[PDB]
UniProtKB/TrEMBL annotation:
This is Major prion protein. Disulfide bonds join C61-C96. Keywords: Amyloid, Cell membrane, Copper, Disulfide bond, Glycoprotein, Golgi apparatus, GPI-anchor, Lipoprotein, Membrane, Metal-binding, Prion, Repeat, Signal, Transmembrane, Transmembrane helix, Zinc. The keyword Signal applies.
Length: 113
């Protein structure tokens, strides 16, 4: 007995490896490589055939992907900070953006949506 807050049938594409991110700080990439096993390897979005812009798509994808992890286990004792939210964001954004550039094509051969 635990319903969801009411997602509208967002779906999940693929799992892909760690994107080639470059922080220029040892402590930053060192936080990433540790928490490499904390963060998701996957991203959640509505279908490309119901979109018309990427900047909206990124915002919603980052929202929902983080939401479905943060505001899921926070209630079990998982509190994080901007450092964590920015680390996961940099991963979730880089995933979901590159994923949209891939998955749109696999969705869309003509649509013009």
């Amino acid at each position: 007995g635990s319903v969801v807050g009411g997602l509208g049938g967002y779906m999940l594409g693929s799992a892909m490896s760690r994107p080639m991110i470059h922080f220029g700080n040892d402590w930053e990439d060192r936080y990433y490589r540790e928490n490499m096993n904390r963060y998701p390897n996957q991203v959640y979005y509505r279908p490309v055939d119901q979109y018309n812009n990427q900047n909206n798509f990124v915002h919603d994808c980052v929202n929902i992907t983080i939401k479905q992890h943060t505001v899921t286990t926070t209630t079990k004792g998982e509190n994080f900070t901007e450092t964590d939210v920015k680390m996961m964001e940099r991963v979730v954004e880089q995933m979901c953006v590159t994923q949209y550039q891939k998955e749109s094509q696999a969705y869309y051969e003509g649509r013009s949506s």
